[PDB]
Structure 1
Amino acid sequence: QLDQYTLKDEIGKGSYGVVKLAYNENDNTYYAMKVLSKKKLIRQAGGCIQPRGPIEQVYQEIAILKKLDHPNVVKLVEVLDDPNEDHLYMVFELVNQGPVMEVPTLKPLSEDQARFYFQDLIKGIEYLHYQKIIHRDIKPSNLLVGEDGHIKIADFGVSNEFKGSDALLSNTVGTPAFMAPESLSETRKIFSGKALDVWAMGVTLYCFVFGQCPFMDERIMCLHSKIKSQALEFPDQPDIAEDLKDLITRMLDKNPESRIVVPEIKLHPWVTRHGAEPLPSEDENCTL
């Protein structure tokens, strides 16, 4: 159908475009293909005036993805781009089992299953931050489970690259239920990028064990208010360890300055099973 690829069914939809299953007849491998329509992006952008154009943002995402080579992050294999054709194809390695969870759910993960996946998430995010990338859309439906049972981070549509020790950001992107209070607040005009990913990791972990979001409303403007102003409250069931409760509370600290950072999360008693399952060092995980 397309070069050496046989296109198959649509399997997911991220922030942009459609992901479909494809089969490469030359290497007998299945791939996931993100398909973008250039005219669609331009039409939908409309009269919007922005520093960066819609097609330009796509190229920035491609550049980000080309940097990444880690077992807990998706792998971009190829880009098929013809200036004459409307569609652009981003070919990724397939992660066979799909999203770890869709929220809400009546069947959440056990505490042990959540720890296993949360460890993968920590390693993948430590790597992204090491590579100077803020994901900005961490949520359970963007965490794909491989055939080997491990998580890979996907959907870099709203991600950005930063030059310094941290990213200094002023705009609000991603999924509303996972957005940090700082990003939504008019008082906080700029905010740390790393702390946004940690907040979203916190919402994600709460989702893992409870099958529901900490903050939710049908009206998005109310949801923003609850994120900023509603106290974190845990459900009665399942009854989780105080251990885990403490970690989630610190990740969902509404003040980004006192919020727990990734190097502290790595050593948290819940994550490590009190030192039984320690994570590798930053260098071992990122440049090894």
Structure 2
Amino acid sequence: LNQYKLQSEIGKGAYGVVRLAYNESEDRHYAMKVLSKKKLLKQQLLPLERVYQEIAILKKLDHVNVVKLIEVLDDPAEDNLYLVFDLLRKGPVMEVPCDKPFSEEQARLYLRDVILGLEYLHCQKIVHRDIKPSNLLLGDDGHVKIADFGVSNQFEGNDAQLSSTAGTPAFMAPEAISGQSFSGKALDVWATGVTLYCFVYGKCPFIDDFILALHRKIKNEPVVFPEEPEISEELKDLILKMLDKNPETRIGVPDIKLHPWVTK
């Protein structure tokens, strides 16, 4: 739309692409997500319907640990739909794999951010469904914000009752990979455990190039802390509680906030 110059591509989420966008008059840069309606059709909730579900979520979001939607340039004549967010120019906090992970204490501060954001979203009746390091954007204030609401869902009552899979394989909980329907909240906690694991190790806890072997490692193998880097027994204990294969016993968000690794 009139007031923005679209510059280079900066990231690519689940749908569309994100481009750096300059407001020439305002002397100010933004993150613009661009969706092509022709491209959407090729990828019972239809596309274009699914986009406006996302937009409905995005408009509610008002938390320091979640991204902020500014406006929607949305001309029915044009093919493109444009979603304008505030820019966090540093981008994702981490891309996995990577050789240099964060210290345990830097990881703790990033987990607090992600938990506070998740709590907000859960309080607001949203589940994210694709929490991973590459969807956590680093602010200039040192805090991460949760991005990419492409597979996220609104729900009623205590929890989202979900049938199908969505988001990234490596961060899907055992119960989601089928038959019976499962907790939204619990799937978000599992992904955040895998995220916490990535923060301190730089690699996922279950790794395989073939998806069937990944599924079995997720469903059956235990979490394995390598000897190096060394982390604390208190952190290991939180990770095992978050990567608990049974969603009934798995630690919920309110008790993660009271875990001694989180608080001290």
TM-score (structure 1 length as normaliser) = 0.90
Kindly provide the amino acid, as one letter, of the partner of residue 134 in structure 1.
V
* Residue 17 of structure 1 pairs with residue 8 of structure 2: no
Q: Counterparts in 2 of 1:44-55, with a 5 A limit?
A: 44-45=42-43, 51-55=44-48
Q: Which amino acid aligns with 2:117?
A: G
Per the TM alignment, residue 220 of structure 1 is displaced from its structure 2 partner at its CA by 1.0
Q: Does 1:257 align with 2:256?
A: no
Give, in angstroms, the shift of residue 95 of structure 1. 1.0
Alignment pair present for 1:135 and 2:135: no
Aligned residue number for residue 155 of structure 1: 148
How far did 1:200 drift? 0.3
Counterpart of 2:87 (choices 87, 94, 105) is 94
Aligned partner of 2:36 in structure 1 is: 37
Shift of 1:27: 2.4
Secondary structure at 2:48 match in 1: helix
Separation of aligned partners in 1, 2:215 and 2:152: 21
Q: Of the candidates 161, 167, 189, which is equivalent to residue 160 of structure 2?
A: 167
1:1-288 correspondence runs (5 A): 2-42=1-41, 44-45=42-43, 51-184=44-177, 186=178, 189-273=180-264
- Distance of 2:52 and 2:236 partners within structure 1: 40
Alpha-carbon distance between aligned partners in 1 of 2:52 and 2:256, rounded to the nearest angstrom: 33
Using the TM superposition, give the Cα deviation of residue 263 of structure 1 relative to its aligned residue in structure 2, in angstroms.
Answer: 0.6
Partners of 1:213 and 1:165 in 2: how far apart? Answer: 30
CA–CA separation in structure 1 for the residues paired with 2:165 and 2:95: 23
Structure 1 unaligned residues grouped into runs of 5+? 46-50, 274-288
- Aligned partner letter, 2:193: G
For 1:98 and 1:194, the matched residues in 2 are separated by 26
Q: TM-score, normalised by structure 2?
A: 0.98
Provide the secondary structure at the position in 1 that maps to 2:70. Answer: strand
Q: How many residues align?
A: 264
CA RMSD for the aligned pairs? 0.9
**Shift of residue 29 of structure 1?**
1.7
Identity of aligned residues (%): 70
Q: Secondary structure at the match of 1:104?
A: coil
Distance in 2, Cα, partners of 1:180 & 1:117: 21
Stretches (4+) displaced over 6 A: none
Letter in 2 for 1:152: K
- Per-residue deviation, residues 137-158 of structure 1 (Å, max 9, x unmatched): 0000000001111110000000
Deviations 1:128-176 (A, max 9, x none): 0000000000000000001111110000000000011111001100000
The one-letter amino acid of 2:159's match is D
Give how far 1:192 is off.
Answer: 0.6
